From Swiss-Prot, chain A:
It holds the Pfam family ribosomal_L24. Belongs to the universal ribosomal protein uL24 family. GO terms for molecular function: large ribosomal subunit rRNA binding; structural constituent of ribosome. PANTHER family: MITOCHONDRIAL RIBOSOMAL PROTEIN L24. This is Large ribosomal subunit protein uL24. Part of the 50S ribosomal subunit. Might contact the SecYEG translocation complex when it is docked with the ribosome. Gene3D superfamilies: 2.30.30.30. Keywords: Ribonucleoprotein, Ribosomal protein, RNA-binding, rRNA-binding. InterPro entries: KOW, Rib_uL2_dom2, Ribosomal_uL24, Ribosomal_uL24_CS, Ribosomal_uL24_KOW, Translation_prot_SH3-like_sf.
Curated annotation (Swiss-Prot), chain B:
Residues 1-51 are annotated as: Disordered. Residues 18-28 have a biased composition (Gly residues). Gene3D superfamilies: 3.100.10.10. This is Large ribosomal subunit protein uL15. It comes from Escherichia coli (strain K12). Part of the 50S ribosomal subunit. Contacts the 5S rRNA.
From Swiss-Prot, chain C:
One of the primary rRNA binding proteins, this protein initially binds near the 5'-end of the 23S rRNA. It is important during the early stages of 50S assembly. It makes multiple contacts with different domains of the 23S rRNA in the assembled 50S subunit and ribosome. Protein uL4 is a both a transcriptional repressor and a translational repressor protein; these two functions are independent of each other. It regulates transcription of the S10 operon (to which uL4 belongs) by causing premature termination of transcription within the S10 leader; termination absolutely requires the NusA protein. uL4 controls the translation of the S10 operon by binding to its mRNA. The regions of uL4 that control regulation (residues 131-210) are different from those required for ribosome assembly (residues 89-103). Gene3D superfamilies: 3.40.1370.10. Keywords: Antibiotic resistance, Repressor, Ribonucleoprotein, Ribosomal protein, RNA-binding, rRNA-binding, Transcription, Transcription regulation, Transcription termination, Translation regulation. It comes from Escherichia coli (strain K12). Belongs to the universal ribosomal protein uL4 family. Residues 44-71 are annotated as: Disordered. GO terms for cellular component: cytoplasm; cytosol; cytosolic large ribosomal subunit; large ribosomal subunit. GO terms for molecular function: DNA binding; endoribonuclease inhibitor activity; mRNA 5'-UTR binding; RNA-binding transcription regulator activity; rRNA binding; structural constituent of ribosome; translation repressor activity. One of its GO terms (biological process) is response to antibiotic. The erythromycin sensitive allele is dominant over the resistant allele. This is Large ribosomal subunit protein uL4. Changing T131I: Does not regulate the S10 operon; assembles into ribosomes in vivo. InterPro entries: Ribosomal_uL4, Ribosomal_uL4-like, Ribosomal_uL4_dom_sf.
Amino acid sequence: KIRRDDEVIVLTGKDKGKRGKVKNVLSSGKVIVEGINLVKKHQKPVPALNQPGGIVEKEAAIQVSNVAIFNAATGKADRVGFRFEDGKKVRFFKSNSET
Amino acid sequence: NTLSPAEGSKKAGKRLGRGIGSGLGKTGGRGHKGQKSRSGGGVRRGFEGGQMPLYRRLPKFGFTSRKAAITAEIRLSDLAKVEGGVVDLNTLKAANIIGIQIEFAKVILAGEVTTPVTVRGLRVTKGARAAIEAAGGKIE
Amino acid sequence: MELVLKDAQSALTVSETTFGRDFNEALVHQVVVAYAAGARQGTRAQKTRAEVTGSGKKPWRQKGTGRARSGSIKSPIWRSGGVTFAARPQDHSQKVNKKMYRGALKSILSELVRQDRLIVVEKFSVEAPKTKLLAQKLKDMALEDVLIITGELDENLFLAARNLHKVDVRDATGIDPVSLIAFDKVVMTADAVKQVEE
RNA sequence: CGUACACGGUGGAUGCCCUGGCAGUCAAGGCGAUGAAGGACGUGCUAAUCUGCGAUAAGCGUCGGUAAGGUGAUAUGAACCGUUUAACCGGCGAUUUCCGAAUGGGGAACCCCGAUCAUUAUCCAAAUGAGGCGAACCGGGGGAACUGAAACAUCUAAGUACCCCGAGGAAAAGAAAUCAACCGAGAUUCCCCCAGUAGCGGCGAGCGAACGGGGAGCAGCCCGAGCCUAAUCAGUGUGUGUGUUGUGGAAGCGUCUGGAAAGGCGCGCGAUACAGGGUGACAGCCCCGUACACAAUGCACAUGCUGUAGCUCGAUGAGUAGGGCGGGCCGUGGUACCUGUCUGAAUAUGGGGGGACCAUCCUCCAAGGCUAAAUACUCUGACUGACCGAUAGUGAACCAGUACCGUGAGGGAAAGGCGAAAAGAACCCCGGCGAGGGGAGUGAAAAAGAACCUGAAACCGUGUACGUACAAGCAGUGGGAGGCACCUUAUGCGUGUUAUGGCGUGCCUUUUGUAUAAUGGGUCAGCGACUUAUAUUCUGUAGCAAGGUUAACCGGGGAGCCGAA
């Protein structure tokens, strides 16, 4: 699954190629990564979608479908950041099949 | 494979008899429709088991006779001749389908083949005297 | 005659068994037409307790009416009520057994000794834990198209095949004509045949 | 103003979904005067509800598990805690104000004390018991009626409803003065059968066993003395089979559509693990979970062991058996059982019983007592269901047994869903105006905006097609003439609609007869009315065949039933 203590790599959105850590995950499936932000009116570095209106959620609203964590396949993506105190998870992290 | 099988689960196999429409059959479907013997059909059924009566009133009646010995145990010839052999008196009857908790019986020459085994029984009728005499043996 | 059995390797021959009964394709097919889903609550006429309540309880003018668990029954003028026009005490079936049901239960057992039918499998079949092994033993058996039919066995319910195409697992003990031949076709095992013989 | 349709609204059906019910199954099973159940009232920074607690108040402590996230449901603002490893999960311990069955007394929660009955009694309440609660089941007593008998006083419903008292997790029964096919069976209940037979009955309707057999479960023993020690009693040690949570746990693949797949299409896989749910749209191979594994607790039923401790001899219970009078009740017949009054034996060299009485056989011996084991329900935990789906289903999937009603007992609703996220209508104009919106913005498949998915009918508005202030009425049909309007079904072939003419008295039950001044409906949708055991008698089909089928319980049986004179 996806965690907040992990780094993601865009692959489709206009932010394709950008790197960053996962800010937070909502029960909606969307994930906001430290980097994919938008320029508000008074030019305030705050993530948000591009649409006119009053008060709307923050976050650029990224999708786990176009992201890139640890995909077991041939892609253009590269290294990705990932607990350790678990021990058993370290074994999976050591394996080139899981994490 | 991983494709939804054409079928296979519960209502699979053979059934009972002729092409049954739905569950055991009805007569008067739901809603409204004749279904009945017309007239004042409702309150309570017609018959009662007896009559009014006129035939049950006081015809050539009788009465309940006392319990009988509940004799009358078919022990026909053959089926005992073409079966087993000698010694067939009061001791070897359980082997055959002749063994009532009560007592007595009778012999009814169903066949004529000689055996010529002897048989007690405790009863006797016509034909009983015949056979087991011209063939041998002694009845009681 | 001698029904040739098959091992896990679907050998050409193993043991032998058979059943004696005048097969009736018309009757067996006359079997696959009666209750695939025919025990789903009928709608008879005269089959239960039903004891009056007499006077008392709750004040209010009311007449004698069938009351089962606050549910009306046997009362013609109410869902599931008395059917004045007797003869057909249930729900729409078919003008139709003591010899067709059972007789078929026997005739079916004879349908197995037929060429263009199933085949007996050794007892080791029930052992096969996996399901893929079955698909294989059914492929080499040259009867992979039997999945298009159904499947059976003996002892306990063979789980390892409950997934295979069309498979209503059942035991030789209590095998109604149903499992005997799903859609006038089937397949059983060794011990099964023996248990079914009786 | 008639009718059809179009756009918008009203309304809410329908389609889909559903954190709910309904039903079955397994496991498990009492609480309290060490004052419980329930209720009242507090308690979180704000919190009005619910839940958790309770003044160390949705919390405190220990151990173990677990883990970095956490501070209940509400994802708010503020803010706190956590590595001196919290939250959370399991067990246990500490504490636990006042009132409260509390019983000192009074009392609609407030003020002062062991109240009442009873046993022991150092008679000092000093030492103890009872006084409450709890789904049904169980035992011992009291005991109807309507109803059925198509009247009714026997009978029947009832030995039921209801009432009184009481135990357990289980009770009651019980070792035979029995049964009685027998040179036999042989503690008692329960299940099946024997019987719907014997028997009872205005013998009318109805009522209705038992012995035996086949099974489940098997255990026998104690009241005077003699003697001596392994029944019993007292005490000690103290289980095998477990309860919850966490650990050993594989897995986005490709193309296309889309904001997103749990799509279509292609391919592969799990299975001593072929339930279900979650994850942005139908993923058993994404996550949990299902089989599985391990550790924390409770129960630990039993066994072992110490001291007691065998065994032996004789007898065996009179106001009883039995009889009479008056009743209850039972299938109980002069031949069931029990209560009340009166009378009243013998005694094993005796007596009772074997469905009549009295003399003669067989069996067994009362008038004393105890006794394990074999089924019930379903609050609770878990699972399942070809069950229903929010005018369905429990009254309750939304504050519900709440709103609300009655003095009270009691009665008792309606209201589901935007979505990927958040939007849920910013900004501007008008106007008296946060109560009337153009415009515009939001959108995915929201033909989405605060009871928001879809969103019909009755119906309303505008508008369109077409009649229409001489017009006669089922308002059609065929024939021939008229016009207007449209050439997504080119062919002298059709529609919308209408002018005029020839004909034409809605629909449904009751009734001999109803269009009818016979009866019912204003309209609409939904809802709403012919079944569950068995027995008997016929009919259609089909296998087999004087043989045939079983029932309890076992794939075995053949009891038994019907037929065969």
